[PDB]
Symmetry: D2
Subunit: 333 residues, 4 copies
């Protein structure tokens, strides 16, 4: 007969708490909280990696092409968002520890830090954080052996951003000899602008959308991440989100943005707590601490920044290329 | 140098995930969520027992008598309420699993259940849920589901002093109860008798009138029953009250005089104890709401049944709200008893 | 000149709506201000919920729901209602920063006013589909005038339950000369059970053989009772079920075939309706836990026993979509679900 | 007899929703959500100001001197943090509005902006945000969206004693600072000087390794920082640069309360200092949650109020807006427990109730 404790391998989970304070003969009560909090964070990182890798594989094995798999994809990405939302709230627990009580066992941690969280790095990589865009103080130095391996894989293997890019490139309606969404959009913006103080600034920005080369330049830097075609596909799904075939894809784009918002919210709630815990003192990891973590709360680490930025290029309803009754029929189930 | 992974024993924590569906050649994706969810609850149960045991020990070793330890007692009990709040919110994650997807792996779990969580039972016992008062499941004692060391650890948890018992003892020594001192109880009965008489005269001064006489007689009946020590002892034996009559007086002394400096942090403690009771019951209810959607309408009925005042250990602290009186009826503190508390 | 923030939001009304009765009667009590603001915030959100719910009711009433382009709008708004209800459950945390002792200093100035007099809460219960007969003995005589008028309209106009029921009855696949979901489901469950019993009978007499017989007979009784329409009609009339027999079949079709593109957002909608029932009952339970600390076993200013009556509202008697939850009772092995064939795959 | 709707003036609260989209004959459904969300924020701002003004008044009228009132002070400041926590979560509601749908009624709002929220500025000012704390754009434009009585309230919110000023005054009176008494600051400098000397000796005694010279330069970093605590001229210099806000003596009060938090008379005061930090953290989380949403709603597009939008709001997510920034930065100056000046039986009894 299967038993709860055996099923859950609690013989491992609940025998994994060793206070260094106690091991060096000066047991500090709050060190137990510090350990349990990190462990719970790490269990949830594992669940997020389990969800994220199953979704990467659904794109990578071509299953995403079968639209009956979209409910699964959006449920699993929504589940990632719900977990991250709990991980943002979970800082509330560690904030019941005073800086003063933390200061009593802090010495016994050196030089260990969150910089040595394999799962946190795997998570960043698998979503599509680029190493060349990371702020310094580098990242992978902390790791060695069978772990530095897994990290290299996570960097080399296809990211969620790349798989979503590939899928967005294949979006119905972009075909120049098909619905020709882009051609019609350039025309409608160009006309609508002419049919008009302020108009000169928005004229500039809107028509910038149609500059492949500029996009390629901003891309070459890393101020954009998606191919120019992927961006068209995304904008197609935004404007035609009510068309049956675009409903759940739109939900997916929304959830990809949610995961960026919640990852940055996690970075900021971490920062707000570390300020109270250390002030201006440096982290046991070696970094300036507070000031480095503040730098990670930027669009540098927003993988799906393109999806946020498309809100720049929103236009009146009237201008969106009307859906030809035959194209309507292609976008029905 | 100490390394993150080794410090946290992640070689144990992150190698503790075995899908029974995969072990039996039919891996079901959502079983991984089911496993991590329970493991996270159990880590947090372990943290709660760590705080709860530290606080029990502070009461038991007589350290709580030194009022410098009150900040630490109330910080740890508040921290238990903050963890319990997260554990209530944590059901949101397992609710992303459909009943249909749960149905694809639940056969591989049988006959294991949350009924076998050692830590959940330790937590219930250490707060002070009485064996006497538990709803029986399948006509049997909760402790049957446990054998060997786990069974003994649970006996110890039932027999050792509970949070309820240690708070009770501390409440009994609340300053001000001394008959030959401030004599809170004697003075309180006198002021309540006067308050009621003055109230009766204001009313005895219409349809609005005959209602207030019935209501007045209700509030009269209730307030005066507070001084009936035999009614109280009787409700004790029937487990409908949990604290001794004297502990109850101590709690009411803290409620009424909470702004007195020596009673400020003690009042926060009594608030945190009600907080833990309320959050344990919200845990039991959110569990129920989820199980309903997973299994349909029996387990679901025993669970709905744990969502009751039988499992509210500090039910007496809530029910004191029954006996609140106008501020101006509360016995005045003279400059000699103020001094003791200031 | 330009629209100003304060004028746009009519803050001249919103922030001039706070009158402490304690102060009006010459004994200002600080925490009364919190009591007022908390209730006003709840009522703004009730008005928002009614705005979303009325809009979704209309999309069903006018047949716009028949155009499946409108399903993202329907699910987004129903989801939005559950996000708001989540905040309103959390919002009790604010009023619990008020001690029972401080509440006791201004409580007297409230009576005989009570939450029973919340028009919007009653409008919300009625519009979702809380039935008059299945309300706890100890509602509408607390009201009069247009208010009493608006409540009657809310009792007679088509509820979300009735509108979802009608829509579930048109679910594709139920057609006896089409996919014939119900015929094939009965056939597959009957066959699946017959085979499960041969599997059990074939075993040599044992302890776990008899437990399996006992378990088989319970499973068989539950699953076959799904196909007993007279039972369903009997349970409708006792208020134990709410959805028509055919709407139940449509719901189970959406459950089983939820991954089929035409069923993906309908499944999200059914999930949302269960979310709203769960959050409404959580609202009632968080309300009960607070009122217990505030009043104990004292009677409410509105007449009721208080804590005891409020506890009675926390039952499946108030779950409008009970039937959506209880379809979990009738889940079956994946292999028993009638197969979709390249013609019915394409229709969906 | 009193009736619910009348008690709460719902004839005002629920007759305050006017969609501009509908007024200009193009009703947009999601505009209702936009209005109700702002109105709920403005009710809770009003409640926060009610709690805040009541705690300011307890300091200003001297009632805070009587330690009976400390439970009430901490309960109401904790209440403010519980409200702010709901207000941070409340953004999740308005995030169920897509940028696409927002774009359909946005045009009808211009040039109105949250920038024009009287109550938000009253809240900033009464906590104690100073003109020089505010980012150039904020400082320039914020006062000049207001006239008449609204202008007068803004001025009052700046002229009258802020929570920062009233807490500073109270911290200056913290028992144990008096040189003739416990002489906290003198004893602390002596124990830290002695403690650093013992540490230098421990480090110098180690065998001339690489790790040792890492301890040496790390010690010399920690020594400069700790001993800089006792340089009052440096404090006044960081005050001028607005990197610190509290008086040197208020800072000594705060650190006294921190180290001796378990002494009965410092238990609730320590809870107050924690609550003031919580309020600063939740105010900045409110600003950051606002930013994350405004990014999805506008992208790089400028706001209706006149600002760059995303980039201006992002610039308010800064410690220059943290009023009690000094209470956080005291963590820089934590020392081993054994260096904290020992409590004598006489001052112990002084810090009992
Ligand atoms: C009192 C609590 C905490 C303090 C004082 C703290 C402090 C720090 C500091 C100073 C850093 C910068 C690296 C360094 O110099 O060592 C850091 C990074 C990090 N911390 Fe924490 N931390 C705390 C809690 C947590 C928790 C609960 C987690 C959960 C896993 C966590 C995860 C991380 C991660 C992943 C990094 C690397 C982040 C990045 O590079 O972007 N920390 N922490
Ligand atoms: C799909 C999710 C879940 C289902 C269907 C479920 C079902 C049940 C059922 C039916 C029982 C009654 C005993 C029995 O029939 O064996 C039970 C009890 C219990 N479950 Fe769960 N459960 C779930 C998730 C959880 C989680 C996440 C926890 C976290 C620790 C948990 C903890 C418990 C505990 C402690 C009990 C004993 C409760 C008591 O006696 O008051 N369950 N569960
Ligand atoms: C100190 C806080 C509160 C207390 C003591 C309290 C007390 C009560 C009581 C005793 C009743 C039952 C009717 C009666 O006997 O008067 C009731 C019903 C109600 N209350 Fe509250 N209440 C509180 C807060 C709230 C809040 C914040 C709301 C928000 C809208 C609310 C909404 C209602 C509603 C709608 C009802 C009718 C519920 C039903 O019949 O199902 N209450 N309350
Ligand atoms: C779609 C939702 C929202 C958008 C697009 C938005 C946009 C903006 C923008 C662009 C600004 C900068 C001033 C300007 O250029 O106009 C601003 C400031 C502000 N918003 Fe919002 N906002 C939104 C929701 C809210 C809500 C719900 C509140 C609630 C009270 C609010 C309160 C404020 C306040 C107080 C300011 C001034 C902040 C400061 O000066 O630091 N906003 N908002
Ligand atoms: O000031 C510090 C402490 C340290 C830290 C944070 N989380 C941890 C978890 C495990 C561990 F061993 C060390 C840490 C860090 O990052 N800087
Ligand atoms: O239908 C069920 C499943 C089982 C259960 C709940 N939580 C668990 C955790 C681990 C485990 F192995 C089994 C369970 C239970 O009580 N009723
Ligand atoms: O004991 C009580 C208090 C009263 C109450 C609850 N919420 C209210 C809101 C407005 C009002 F005027 C009165 C109330 C109620 O229902 N029973
Ligand atoms: O694009 C926008 C919208 C506008 C805004 C935000 N909150 C408001 C509240 C009332 C109002 F009238 C306008 C607004 C702003 O600041 N930029
Ligand atoms: C057949 C297809 N699933 C079509 C496709 C691609 N990208 C999309 C985005 C939204 C909607 C549909 C699509 C495929 O090529 O994957
Ligand atoms: C000396 C004492 N600490 C007094 C005591 C007991 N219970 C209390 C409740 C509130 C305030 C004080 C007390 C003790 O006997 O523990
Ligand atoms: C044409 C149709 N929209 C079909 C329909 C009805 N109910 C459903 C449930 C799920 C999916 C589709 C339907 C209608 O009649 O409304
Ligand atoms: C008499 C006194 N309440 C003393 C005082 C001032 N600041 C403090 C901080 C913590 C504890 C006490 C104080 C007063 O002067 O206000």
């Amino acid at each position: 007969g299967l038993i709860y404790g055996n099923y859950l391998h609690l013989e491992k989970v609940l025998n994994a708490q060793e206070l260094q304070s106690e091991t060096k003969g000066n047991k500090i009560h709050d060190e137990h909280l510090f350990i349990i909090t990190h462990q719970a964070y790490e269990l949830w990182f594992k669940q997020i990696l389990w969800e994220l890798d199953s979704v990467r594989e659904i794109f990578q094995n071509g299953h995403v092409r079968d639209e009956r798999n979209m409910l699964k994809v959006v449920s699993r990405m929504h589940r990632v968002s719900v977990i991250l939302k709990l991980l943002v709230q979970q800082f509330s627990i560690l904030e019941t520890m005073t800086a003063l009580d933390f200061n009593d066992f802090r010495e016994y941690l050196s030089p260990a830090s969150g910089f040595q969280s394999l799962q946190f790095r795997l998570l960043e990589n698998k979503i599509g954080v680029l190493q060349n865009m990371r702020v310094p103080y580098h990242y992978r130095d902390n790791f060695k052996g069978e772990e530095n391996e897994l990290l290299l894989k996570s960097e080399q293997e296809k990211t969620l951003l790349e798989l979503v890019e590939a899928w967005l490139e294949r979006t119905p309606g972009l075909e120049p000899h098909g619905f020709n969404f882009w051609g019609k959009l350039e025309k409608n913006i160009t006309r609508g602008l002419e049919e008009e103080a302020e108009f000169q600034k928005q004229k500039e920005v809107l028509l910038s959308l149609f500059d492949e080369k500029r996009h390629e330049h901003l891309l070459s830097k890393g101020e954009r991440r998606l191919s120019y075609r992927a961006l068209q596909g995304a904008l197609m799904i935004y404007f035609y989100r009510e068309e049956p075939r675009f409903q759940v894809p739109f939900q997916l784009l929304t959830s990809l943005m949610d995961i960026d918002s919640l990852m940055t919210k996690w970075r900021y709630n971490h920062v707000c707590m570390v300020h109270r815990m250390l002030g201006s003192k440096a982290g046991t990891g070696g970094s300036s601490g507070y000031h480095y973590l503040r730098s990670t709360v930027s669009d540098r680490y927003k993988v799906f920044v393109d999806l946020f930025n498309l809100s720049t290029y929103l236009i009146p309803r009237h201008w969106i290329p009307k859906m030809n009754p035959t194209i309507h029929k292609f976008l029905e189930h």
